[PDB]
Symmetry: C2
Subunit: 276 residues, 2 copies
């Protein structure tokens, strides 16, 4: 077992990361899947990683971390960032359906989003919700926001997109594909399972498909300040992008280190924005 990981490693060495992700997406279609949010084969209950002031237990929006697609990710994704919200805001990390190796994969993105929506609404209660995601997780946070609005009549109070690269601005992901792939292998707490690599490929494909809806929630765009890899100035702007953001905040670090070594800066931008 583990052939997908082996092929993956080779693809990165050969600078064919993008091509391999397509293969993962195609292969993933043959994994058992759940067609109903209710038929989800796993507990999506968010985990409380930080607690806000017990004092003003009034309305106050709660932060919900939308786990990204990285096959090397999981419950550890928001550990560093969340510490900065302790005594400031409750922070709930919600799992992405299909990971954690017999977990069923979602038949389509909306089905996975509904499963998450239900777990989130139950956990948040009457508190307003502000979704937060990084990279693939940022793209998922927005899709989730729109779903909550249209299928659960509950649009979040806001969306925090950390370093998103939406369709239309994928040149940096293409140019730095090798670093994005190496970054995945680096920082892996354990070897990525083929099941999780398949899940990653499936979500990547979901995010590339027709996604009409735009959330009415205000968005905070948090951008890395340093390029992940070499970039020829003539190509244009390598920085992350979102169309018509409510606020834009720049933080130190690159696509990866902005969260790894400068999470406090990210948290700081979020808190100041929430107050406003």
């Amino acid at each position: 077992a583990g052939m997908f990981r082996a092929l993956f490693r080779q693809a990165v060495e050969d600078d064919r990361y993008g091509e391999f992700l397509d293969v993962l997406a195609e292969a993933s279609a043959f994994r058992p899947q759940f067609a109903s949010p209710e038929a989800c084969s796993e507990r999506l209950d968010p985990v409380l990683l930080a607690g806000g002031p017990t004092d003003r237990a009034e309305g106050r929006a709660v932060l919900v971390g939308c786990t990204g697609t990285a096959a090397n990710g999981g419950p550890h994704e928001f550990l560093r960032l969340s510490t900065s919200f302790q005594e400031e805001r409750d922070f709930l990390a919600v799992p992405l359906p299909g990971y954690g190796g017999t977990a069923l994969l979602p038949a389509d993105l909306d089905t996975a989003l509904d499963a998450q929506a239900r777990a989130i609404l139950r956990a948040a209660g009457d508190a307003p919700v502000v979704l937060l995601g990084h990279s693939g997780g940022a793209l998922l946070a927005h899709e989730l926001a729109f779903r909550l609005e249209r299928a659960h009549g509950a649009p979040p109070a806001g969306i925090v997109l950390v370093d998103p690269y939406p369709p239309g601005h994928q040149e940096p992901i293409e140019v730095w594909s090798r670093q994005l792939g190496e970054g995945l292998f680096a920082g892996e707490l354990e070897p990525m399972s083929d099941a999780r690599l398949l899940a990653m490929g499936r979500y990547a494909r979901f995010l590339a498909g027709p996604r009409p809806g735009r959330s009415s929630a205000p968005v905070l765009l948090v951008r890395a300040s340093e390029p992940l890899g070499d970039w020829q100035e003539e190509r244009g702007d390598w920085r992350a992008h979102w169309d018509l953001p409510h606020t834009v905040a720049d933080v130190p670090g690159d696509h990866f280190t902005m969260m790894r070594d400068h999470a406090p800066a990210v948290a700081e931008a979020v808190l100041s924005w929430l107050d406003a």
Copy 2:
């Protein structure tokens, strides 16, 4: 076993054999490979599975079984058939490069063919060679024959194609793809490794590619007499095909049983043909 095997199992269940084979081929591109026959991995030394009469050892053609693409196959493929050649003809089985991951996959078909050619010519000596293959192996036998002729200055003395379904004539085998998939699992002596499933996908892709060269070697076309699945005579002939074969022989059984339960019939047709050809 491996994830690819698991996925393939599901693909077959869902009747999506063709689609998964395509996935296997695409994935095989990320496996280490050899671009030079001299750079090949394993030893392709043909194995002697049957011995012919000692009374003659100079002009009699020797049979060379060309291993097929099945990920569950290997050294076992021609065992049952070879039995009928004992005391009749030497029967050598040549491995298909890339199977047992470790084993490097050929960069292209010609590279694998060249590796096989070298091994076969070394083993055959001055004895003429008649290539024999079943299904995918039949297509491979002809491709090998052409390469032998075009790049090794040695066309084989003949080619035995057992139930080939060449490009332009594979609708029956595509319609019956589910049974092909079930046959693979229903025939494993051990779980098919993901490495061999990838090799199988890569060769399948090779054989679907453009290969205009036709061997000048005479062809014996052996066809199964029973359909592997449902067909409906309105659809046309479901049988295996080859353009203008020198001789055609029909044997009992289907695409698969012809090489098991009815292997003696296949061997009989071959021996009979070798005599007429010689």
